[PDB]
Nucleic acid binder design. Structure first.
Lengths: 212, 216
DNA sequence: GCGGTTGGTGGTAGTTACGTTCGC
């Protein structure tokens, strides 16, 4: 079976930049190579087929080239909506096979997160558990550090984070950090704080509340 | 319009069976093969195989023929993927896909795709989520969607009328083996007490529908 | 006019370039 390898596996580039993604086949595939674009929660969409043919409806900034075992997808002027995973696919020999995918992130200017903290609801507490939620809203770049301080003692390792996919319009991210305690454990502490470090912040931002 | 509509996805125990369907419309059904492609959560694309829709002849990749069967009902313009002896590693979104209107002279590519149907193979039991409010010139508010299985969950605000500033986070798998997520939105602090804010949570797998007023 | 987004007959085949179509 033909193994297809893309390079790079992930890249970041600015609006208007030229981006190239390479696809290498484990054997000669006779120009039978297609490119697809896949956005979060959508099926893949064909962009280029048969090496170099642009599909109807696809902007002319997308082009494809290659022969033998080496193929390239070029985006001549990257746009915010091009956030997506791109896949090459051979149809020389069954089974048809895809590359592993290349994730493309869109660079933008640094944007600090807006930080919010949420105490556990009475509804959850009545069931015997307490989730404290820290929200970091609309920031770039993606790297952010969240520390949890409960009466000044660090509990960061007990929390779980989730990050949104990059926004296809404004190229920002949002992040949640959730620290879940038993009702009993929650009630033995007073001050709950999340402290946020990000490139957009000259010093850490802390949001906190006092239990009850 | 050419469309492919899939159905039949759901939660099934290891060793169990599921039949997926791919209903085609808006073209001559027997002029195009039907292809099946799957994608494991957060993973790449894998071609399962295809079937010639006139001859009914299937071609399977790798070892899928042991456990999977492609079939047709041309009177319904529908292709089927029957899956038997399902394993955990079969958890994936399953797509059907067809070649372009003109595919001659090697113009072969997946032109139109179904929307996908998620197959989850797990010994874990279905569980509906608990929905808790995340209480609030910009205020943030939200809903915590806690302790559910399997995927997926959908969240809307005010029955879809509120879209600006909405962020629904990807679920995280907890130690328990249950998923949890939050959905949040930003509003003017002035509107707290003015506008009612309701998050609408749908967890089809457990037939759970919950509307939750998020009050300050 | 001419390349796709289409129509229609035949048919064991990606079947596929054609015409009756569609759209710049």
């Amino acid at each position: 079976d033909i193994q297809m390898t893309q390079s790079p596996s992930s890249l970041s580039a600015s609006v208007g930049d030229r981006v190239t993604i390479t696809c290498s086949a484990s054997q000669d595939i006779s120009n039978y190579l297609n490119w697809y674009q896949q956005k979060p929660g959508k099926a893949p969409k064909v962009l280029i087929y048969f090496t170099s043919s642009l599909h109807s409806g696809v902007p002319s900034r997308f082009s494809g080239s290659g022969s033998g075992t080496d193929f390239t997808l070029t985006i001549s002027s990257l746009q915010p909506e091009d956030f997506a995973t791109y896949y090459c696919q051979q149809y020389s020999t069954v089974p048809w096979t895809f590359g592993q995918g290349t994730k493309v992130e869109i660079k933008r200017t640094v944007a600090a997160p807006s930080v919010f903290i949420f105490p556990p609801s009475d509804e959850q507490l009545k069931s015997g558990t307490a989730s404290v939620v820290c929200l970091l809203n609309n920031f770039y770049p993606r790297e952010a550090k969240v520390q949890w301080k409960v009466d000044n003692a660090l509990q960061s390792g007990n929390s779980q984070e989730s990050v949104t996919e990059q926004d296809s319009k404004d190229s920002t991210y949002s992040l949640s950090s959730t620290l879940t305690l038993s009702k009993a454990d929650y009630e033995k502490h007073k001050v709950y704080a999340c402290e946020v470090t990000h490139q957009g912040l000259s010093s850490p931002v802390t949001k906190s509340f006092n239990r009850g | 319009e050419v469309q492919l509509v899939e159905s039949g996805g759901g939660l099934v125990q290891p060793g169990g069976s599921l039949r997926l369907s791919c209903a085609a419309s808006g073209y001559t059904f027997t002029n195009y093969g039907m292809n099946w492609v799957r994608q494991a959560p957060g993973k790449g694309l894998e071609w399962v195989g295809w079937i010639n829709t006139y001859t009914g002849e299937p071609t399977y990749a790798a070892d899928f023929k042991r456990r999977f069967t492609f079939s047709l009902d041309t009177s319904k313009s529908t292709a089927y993927l029957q899956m038997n002896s399902l394993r955990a590693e079969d958890t994936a979104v399953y797509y059907c896909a067809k070649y372009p209107h003109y595919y001659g002279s090697s113009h072969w590519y997946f032109d139109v795709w179904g929307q996908g149907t998620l197959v989850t193979v797990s010994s874990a039991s279905t569980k509906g989520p608990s929905v808790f409010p995340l209480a609030p010139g910009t205020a943030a508010l939200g809903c915590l969607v806690k302790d559910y299985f399997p995927e997926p969950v959908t969240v809307s605000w005010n029955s879809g009328a509120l879209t600006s500033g909405v962020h629904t986070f990807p679920a995280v798998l907890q130690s328990s083996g249950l998923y949890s997520l939050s959905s949040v939105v930003t509003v003017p602090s002035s509107s707290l007490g003015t506008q009612t804010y309701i998050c609408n949570v749908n967890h089809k797998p457990s037939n759970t529908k919950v509307d939750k007023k998020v009050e300050p």
